A paper describes a structure:
The RcCas13a-crRNA binary complex exhibits a markedly increased stability of about 10 °C. We determined the X-ray crystal structure of the binary complex by experimental phasing, using crystals of SeMet-labeled RcCas13a protein and refined the final coordinates against data collected on native RcCas13a-crRNA complex crystals to 2.1 Å resolution (for X-ray data processing, structure solution and refinement statistics see Table 1). Protein residues as well as nucleobases of the repeat-region and the first 16nt’s of the spacer in the crRNA are well defined in the electron density. However, we did not observe electron density for the C-terminal 120 aa residues, that are unique to RcCas13a. Here, in the composite active site made up by the HEPN1 and HEPN2 domains, His 469 of the conserved catalytic tetrad (Arg 464 + His 469/Arg 1052 + His 1057) is shifted about 18 Å away, preventing endonuclease activity prior to target RNA binding. Thus, the stable contracted conformation of the binary complex as observed in RcCas13a, likely prevents premature activation of the RNase function. Distinct to the crRNAs from Lba, Lbu, Lse and LshCas13a, the stem-loop in the crRNA of RcCas13a is extended by one C-G base pair and an additional 3.4 Å interaction between the twisted C-28 (3N) and G-5 (1N) at the base of the stem, next to the conserved U-A base-pair can be observed. We tested all RcCas13a mutants for their pre-crRNA cleavage activity and could identify Arg 1085, Asn 1089 and His 1113 as key residues essential for pre-crRNA processing.
Due to cleavage of cellular transcripts they induce dormancy in the host cell and thus protect the bacterial population by aborting the infectious cycle of RNA-phages. Here we report the structural and functional characterization of a Cas13a enzyme from the photo-auxotrophic purple bacteria Rhodobacter capsulatus.
Numbering used by the authors: 1 to 64, 74 to 398, 404 to 803, 811 to 869, 885 to 1166
The structure:
RNA sequence: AUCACCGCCAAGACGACGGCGGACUGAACCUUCAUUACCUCUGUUUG
């Protein structure tokens, strides 16, 4: 929360004797504190609210700073006087006086006169003191102007009797109870900020009769003129000032009051809602409507309706939206409640903990629905690539009947299967009848995964539904259509695949380490212990934490912190450095020692460390947490040492609560995720740029990296893996030909449903499998979930979840085992079209360890994924438009030509790093024109190399395909929300209401149209990609998706932002124009990477050199799939 | 559309023309992979 910068989270629970939700504050994740009590007594929160109160009487300098002496003295006088009051009030301790003064004067407390010419210097006094008067100066100065009097008024306002901004008391009660000050009033307002459980406050308390009276004169058009007049005045300044909604708010409020007076003869708004419809109910809703419009950060004025017609339409749509938001909320709670025990109104899922539980479940569902949409697309290409089979679902009874009846189709599918399964001797000798059973089963296993409306819960009912479908080896009946019985062989073949992959795991894990030279850089005892630990973590494991960062990023952070502290004279700060190695650049992995160290570290981190760290508590957790905080504080004080109050500065990490005693790392990492969600929203408020928001919110992620870096180092030392850290780059092997240990048995005991699920996973990309395990881990890590008080209920639940996890892990650890060192299991001939000369494609990618070899393998795996979906039909035209020419191949060769001498690219790369470090080490602020010219020249060669590699090895083509899939994937995710909100939650909601609120049911029902449901289907089944000729239009898709999500404005509005932000993350800059409610005129450019940012030429001027990430060829491709064009700035 | 969206604090008199909450709500963030990979390191307070 923001209020007074008070620390802690808010929780909503039941317990109140009224039987309703109440919001409390928790400081350690466990305790519960009442808002009025806390916000009236907490030192930090009090001081925060006091200074906020002072800031509205006398403003501090704008920061979006340096005050005048007049301004400074004014703030100081008021501060001192107010301090004296609250001190004597017994609200303020002497201990906290310094904090109060630091926060009264955040700009600093030591300045020389304004005409002095000193380092720290006041601004010249303004011509009028009113320059720094705030909105509340008038109200607080009614009983005089002196500091003593301003302070007295502020104190009364905050702690005794709340005033309006005009200086009048807000409340004049006649009862036994005195009216509160602002602090308590606002705190009570927070206390009752809880989810509505019913429809009471959604009824519209006015109609046509009220409209006739109220809109005799068009208030909306006149308010619109207020907005235009506000715009013009701000636009009249030489620097064009933009008007915010917060500045418009008072002008609209006055205009609306004058309107009420015109209608009623009075400005008194107080009305009687219970008495029935009224003009003042309508007015209250008009005020609320403009309150919403004025809360907008961007272009508030532009959104103002121009007309009574527009205003009433906005009010209607907003009302319709709020009803559907409330009905989705209710229907979701009910769905998660089920039967349980309790009284829908008292359900755990109304609470903050319960809503967090819902959120992580819902996200798992999205990922699940998403993974099996891709599976569907994969199975389509497997079975019916040319669409020989208006239901577009191959698993539907009508279509699956056609598949099995077609003998050639089934046979051709079995012959193509290698692209999905790899080499599968297990499936070779089923026979034609056996094959038909097998193709049928996988379609039914897909359907069993895909046709689930489910959620996560303590019973693991979801996995039970999965098991019910996937344990089947027979379907239907003999007397009726679709009788399929799997043959004993077909069954054994299904069960054998997962069995053999498991059996093979031990030796694969050994070979992985062996092939990365790990056994060459470790004693036999050390290597043996490492290998044993890795296999043990995969074979027998509890549900671990996915909260761990990626090792590379952890290592990057550790490297960055090490680098800074090692540059400081104060050696005490060197303590915050680890001996963890830097992250390797890809080229550095060519060095055996470097590979060995990184792979050993990577496998250790992901498996044995993750297993160990997840359940850790006490000193092993608290030690690294504290150290991470100490480090951030040390870093902050060093960087900003010159700035004010530097000796008391703490890292922003210090706001975060320490781990509780008995809390596991898994639990503390999950709590931290809550902080991140909150921090991103807060940052988006200060700046709406998603990437700048991420930078300002990154301190949380950097705390986790620092904390985990210290834990990882500690673990390495504690378990005797120090040797890994001691391997130095370029070191020659300890043993030239080491004797490896025996492979450990990795055999498992798998149920049929696991084997079935495992085979369906072969139609889902590995990344999406990984995402499923990551979310499963996140959901399992969640504290405060609904549980059972049924003793063995949790034992069965835990068995299902463990078996599910084993399927995912085995799939991931097996990776390319059935593909490696074998020919491409698909036709490469269609991909010749991507080259001008087909012979050139053949020479490069059609076979007749090294770095060129790894690159060819990467490309072929890329093409495989396109073939897996049968997507050459979708992007053949576009790809063939951007054919790779022989001159590009030749140019790339000569740039990389290493046979005679240092190749062009290697020379360029080394010159660039050489110069960068020379600048950043010897003089980070400066660079000579000649140094800068060679730097630019190096970048140019580097760019040319990147662009040619991107074309010759088809990087551009594969990135375009991936981008396309990601965009459509994001829209499919929205489609899942449509299906689920409308098909489940709203239906549930409508049934609770019954005949009481038919108006709400008609509004719920409005969520659906034929076109929206069609868009849901077309997205789900990639029907938008089903065009033999031409390129897909993603702009039109986004527009269809916007319309699909119209039932929920927050989603409809977010649809385009999702896609923009997705591209931005990659450095692609997309822009649309909105005309007639449709996105259009898509343009594409890129964000250049800025080298030598704050570095100046020795001769003067910015020394900045810019690097392009992407070729014009790729930008053109991206533009084409958005039916747009490239527009690079000049 | 491109930070929105939902909700809370009612009046003894002319206003809420002011204050707020929000893992609570979408959007983000985080993420198995010897991937394309490039931006010195590091970051208080305000906002």
């Amino acid at each position: 929360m923001q209020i007074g910068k008070v620390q802690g989270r808010t929780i909503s629970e039941f317990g109140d004797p009224a039987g309703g939700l109440k919001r409390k504050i928790s400081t350690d994740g466990k305790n519960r504190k009442e808002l009025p009590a806390h916000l009236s007594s907490d030192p930090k929160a009090l001081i925060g609210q006091w200074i906020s109160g002072i800031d509205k009487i006398y403003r501090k300098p704008d920061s979006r700073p340096t005050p005048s002496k007049m301004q400074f003295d004014a703030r100081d006088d008021l501060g001192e006087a107010f301090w004296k009051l609250v001190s004597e009030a017994g609200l303020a301790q002497d201990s906290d006086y310094d904090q109060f003064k630091r926060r009264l004067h955040p700009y600093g407390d030591k300045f020389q006169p304004a005409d002095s010419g000193a380092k720290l210097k006041f601004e010249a006094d303004p011509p009028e003191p009113q320059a720094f008067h705030g909105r509340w100066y008038g109200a607080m100065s009614k009983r005089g102007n002196d500091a003593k009097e301003l302070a007295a008024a502020l104190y009364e306002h905050l702690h005794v009797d709340e005033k309006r901004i005009d200086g009048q008391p807000k409340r004049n009660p006649k009862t036994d109870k005195f009216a509160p000050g602002l602090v308590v009033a606002r705190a009570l307002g927070i206390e009752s900020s809880v989810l509505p459980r019913g429809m009471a406050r959604l009824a519209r308390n006015w109609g046509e009769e009220e409209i006739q009276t109220y809109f005799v004169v068009d208030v909306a058009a006149s308010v619109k003129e207020v907005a235009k007049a506000a715009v013009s005045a701000a636009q009249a300044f030489d620097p064009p000032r933009q008007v915010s909604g917060r500045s418009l708010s008072p002008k609209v409020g006055f205009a609306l009051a004058e309107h009420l007076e015109r209608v009623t003869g009075s400005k008194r708004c107080s009305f009687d809602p219970a008495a029935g419809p009224s003009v003042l109910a309508l007015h209250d809703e008009v005020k609320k409507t403009y309150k919403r419009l004025c809360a907008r950060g961007k272009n508030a004025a532009r959104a103002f309706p121009a007309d009574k017609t527009e205003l009433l339409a906005l009010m209607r749509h907003t009302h319709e939206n709020r009803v559907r938001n409330q009905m989705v909320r209710m229907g979701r709670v009910s769905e998660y409640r089920g039967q349980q025990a309790g009284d829908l109104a008292q359900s755990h899922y109304w609470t903050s903990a319960g809503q967090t539980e819902i959120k992580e479940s819902e996200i798992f569902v999205r990922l699940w629905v998403g993974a099996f949409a891709l599976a569907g697309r994969s199975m389509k290409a497997w079975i019916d690539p040319m669409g020989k089979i208006n239901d577009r679902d191959l698993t539907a009874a009508v279509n699956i009947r056609q598949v099995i009846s077609n003998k050639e189709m089934v046979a051709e599918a079995m012959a193509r299967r290698g692209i999905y399964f790899g080499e599968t001797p297990e499936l070779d000798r089923l026979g034609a009848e056996g094959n038909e059973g097998f193709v049928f089963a996988l379609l039914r296993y897909l359907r069993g995964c895909r046709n689930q409306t489910f959620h996560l819960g303590a019973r693991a009912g979801f996995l039970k539904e999965i098991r019910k479908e996937l344990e089947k080896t027979r379907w239907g009946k003999a007397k009726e259509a679709e009788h399929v019985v799997l043959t004993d062989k077909t069954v054994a073949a299904i069960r054998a695949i997962i069995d053999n992959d498991a059996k093979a795991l031990g030796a694969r894990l050994l070979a992985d380490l062996s092939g990365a030279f790990v056994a060459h850089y470790a004693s036999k005892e050390h290597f043996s212990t490492l290998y044993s630990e890795i296999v043990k973590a995969v074979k027998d494991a509890p549900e671990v934490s996915s909260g761990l960062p990626r090792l590379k990023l952890l290592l990057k952070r550790a490297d960055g912190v090490r680098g800074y502290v090692h540059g400081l004279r104060d050696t005490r700060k060197h303590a915050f450095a680890t001996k963890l190695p830097p992250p390797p650049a890809p080229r550095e992995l060519d060095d055996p020692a470097t590979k060995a160290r990184y792979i050993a570290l990577l496998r250790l981190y992901d498996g044995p460390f993750r297993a160990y760290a997840s359940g850790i508590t006490g000193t092993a957790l608290a030690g690294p947490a504290a150290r991470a905080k100490e480090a951030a504080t040390a870093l902050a004080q060093s960087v900003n040492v010159t700035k004010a109050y530097s000796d008391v500065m703490e890292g922003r990490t210090s706001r975060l609560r320490p781990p509780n005693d008995g809390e596991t790392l898994r639990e503390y990492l999950s709590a931290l995720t809550g902080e991140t969600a909150t921090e991103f929203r807060v940052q988006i408020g200060y700046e709406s740029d998603s990437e700048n928001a991420r930078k300002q919110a990154e301190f949380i992620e950097n705390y986790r990296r620092d904390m985990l870096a210290f834990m990882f180092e500690d673990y390495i030392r504690a378990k005797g893996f120090d040797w890994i850290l001691k391997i130095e780059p370029g070191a020659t092997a300890m043993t030239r030909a080491p004797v490896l240990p025996e492979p450990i048995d990795t055999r498992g005991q798998y149920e049929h449903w696991q084997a079935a699920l495992y085979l369906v996973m072969h139609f889902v990309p590995a990344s999406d499998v990984s995402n499923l395990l990551h979310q499963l881990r996140k959901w399992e890590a969640l504290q405060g979930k609904y549980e059972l008080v049924q003793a063995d209920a949790r034992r069965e639940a835990l068995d299902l979840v463990k078996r599910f996890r084993d399927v995912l892990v085995l799939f991931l650890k097996t990776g390319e085992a059935r593909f490696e060192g074998r020919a491409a299991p698909f036709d490469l001939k269609p991909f010749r079209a991507l080259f001008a000369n087909p012979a050139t494609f053949d020479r490069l990618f059609m076979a007749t360890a090294s770095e060129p070899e790894l690159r060819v393998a990467r490309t072929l795996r890329g093409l495989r994924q396109i073939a897996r979906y049968n997507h050459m039909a979708v992007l053949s035209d576009l790809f063939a438009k951007h054919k790779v020419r022989d001159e590009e191949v030749a140019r790339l060769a000569e740039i990389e030509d290493e046979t005679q001498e240092k190749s062009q690219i290697v020379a360029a790369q080394e010159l660039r790093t050489d110069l960068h470090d020379k600048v950043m080490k010897c003089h980070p602020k400066t660079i000579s024109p000649e140094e800068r010219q060679s730097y630019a020249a190096a970048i140019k060669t580097i760019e040319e190399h990147r662009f040619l590699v991107g074309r010759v090895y088809l990087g551009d083509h594969l990135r375009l395909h991936r981008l396309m899939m990601d965009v459509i994937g994001r829209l499919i995710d929205y489609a899942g929300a449509y299906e689920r909100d409308t098909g489940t939650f709203l239906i549930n909601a409508s049934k609770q209401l019954g005949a009481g609120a038919d108006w709400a049911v008609t509004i719920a029902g409005a969520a659906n149209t034929d076109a929206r449901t069609q868009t849901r289907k077309d997205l789900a089944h990639f029907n938008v990609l089903d065009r033999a000729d031409g390129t897909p239009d993603l702009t039109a898709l986004v527009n269809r998706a916007r319309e699909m999500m119209a039932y929920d404005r927050k989603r409809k509005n977010a649809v385009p932002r999702s896609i923009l932000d997705m591209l931005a993350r990659l450095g692609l800059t997309l822009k649309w124009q909105m005309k007639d409610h449709l996105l259009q005129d898509a343009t594409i450019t890129q964000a250049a990477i800025k080298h030598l940012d704050k570095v100046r030429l020795t001769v003067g001027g910015p020394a900045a050199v810019t690097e392009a990430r992407f070729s014009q060829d790729y930008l053109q491709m991206v533009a084409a799939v958005f039916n747009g064009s490239v527009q690079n700035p000049k």
